[PDB]
């Protein structure tokens, strides 16, 4: 989605309503957020918190990134999230996902001025 920050909002933010989600949530959202255009993106996480709350994680607990960079941050509080995982029977362009709701700490990578999330690293 143009800027890395905009791409993070498109791929990972859903405070647009849902405090949680339904059984077809990932099927709809993986498609509507354009994560099934080129291929079936195999896994993706949506965060059901305010943009302000998720942007705030960039000033919280500094942790190592999976790629070995040092610009990752873990939320002090648990956040409402939805994990989407491509099913065994899923075949492009009919991408199929399991919708898993959870409350976990998020880990995001941050970059830029202003310093904002550009990558979803993990939930713990």
Ligand X SMILES: Nc1ncnc2c1ncn2[C@@H]1O[C@H](COP(=O)(O)NCC(=O)O)[C@@H](O)[C@H]1O
With a CB cutoff of 8 Å and minimum separation 6, the contacts of 53 are 79
**Of 7, 24, 107, 14, nearest to 65 (Cα)?**
107
Tokens 């849902």 belong to which residue? Answer: 18
Choose, by CB under 6 A, the member of 25, 57, 118, 123 that binds ligand X.
118
Taking the complex as a whole, the smallest distance from the CB of residue 108 to ligand X amounts, in Å, to 8
100 phi and psi angles, rounded to 5 deg? -120, 110
Q: Does 119 contact ligand X by CB under 6 A?
A: yes
Q: Per CB under 6 A, which of residues 68..87 are in contact with ligand X?
A: 69, 71-72
Select the residue interacting with ligand X from 3, 7, 94, 115 (CB under 6 A).
7
Active site residues: 12, 119
User: Which residues contribute to the site for ligand X (CB under 6 A)?
Assistant: 7-8, 11-12, 65, 67, 69, 71-72, 109, 111, 118-120
């Amino acid at each position: 989605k143009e800027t890395a920050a905009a791409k993070f909002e498109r791929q990972h933010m859903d405070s647009s309503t849902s405090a949680a989600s339904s059984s077809n949530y990932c099927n709809q959202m993986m498609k509507s957020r354009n994560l099934t255009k080129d291929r079936c993106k195999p896994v993706n996480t949506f965060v059901h918190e305010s943009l302000a709350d998720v942007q705030a994680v960039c000033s919280q607990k500094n942790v190592a990134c999976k790629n070995g960079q040092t610009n990752c941050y873990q939320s002090y509080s648990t956040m409402s999230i939805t994990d989407c995982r491509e099913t065994g029977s899923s075949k492009y362009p009919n991408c199929a996902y399991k919708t898993t709701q959870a409350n976990k700490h998020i880990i995001v990578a941050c970059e830029g001025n202003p310093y904002v999330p550009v990558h979803f690293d993990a939930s713990v």
